[PDB]
Amino acid sequence: FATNPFDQDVEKATSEMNTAEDWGLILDICDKVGQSRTGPKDCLRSIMRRVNHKDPHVAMQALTLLGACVSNCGKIFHLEVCSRDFASEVSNVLNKGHPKVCEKLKALMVEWTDEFKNDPQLSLISAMIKNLKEQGVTFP
Numbered sequence: 001f002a003t004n005p006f007d008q009d010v011e012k013a014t015s016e017m018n019t020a021e022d023w024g025l026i027l028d029i030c031d032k033v034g035q036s037r038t039g040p041k042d043c044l045r046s047i048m049r050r051v052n053h054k055d056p057h058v059a060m061q062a063l064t065l066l067g068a069c070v071s072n073c074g075k076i077f078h079l080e081v082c083s084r085d086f087a088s089e090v091s092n093v094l095n096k097g098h099p100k101v102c103e104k105l106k107a108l109m110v111e112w113t114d115e116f117k118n119d120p121q122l123s124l125i126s127a128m129i130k131n132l133k134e135q136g137v138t139f140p
Helices: 007-013 023-033 039-051 056-072 075-081 084-096 099-116 124-134
Strands: none
Touching: 007 023, 007 039, 007 056, 023 039, 023 056, 039 056, 039 075, 039 084, 056 075, 056 099, 075 099, 084 099, 084 124, 099 124
């Protein structure tokens, strides 16, 4: 019965009508995440639904929103991204996704492992990279 409070803003920020992702709507999303206990998880789940959209223009906009949340929301968001739920969502996107979408998601992962390298609680992204490399996936 419950609706995700991020769904509406995430849709406008990543609309197919947009020439590019709306940054004003991105920063408002980042600020909103930090206002509630469930903000990080609610937002990440909403983002991943848009990353899974049929139109790659929508999926590309969603990945820049994902990157902005990891950049601006701090450890609380990094912990959400460091989950089995995200790892499942990553392999589901890489197996069905457009090459342009796969390129961007894998690029973000390489950036995150470098950013998370000094935190042992944030090792999951590096573990996902190693696991995907065993399956023959390349990470430039």
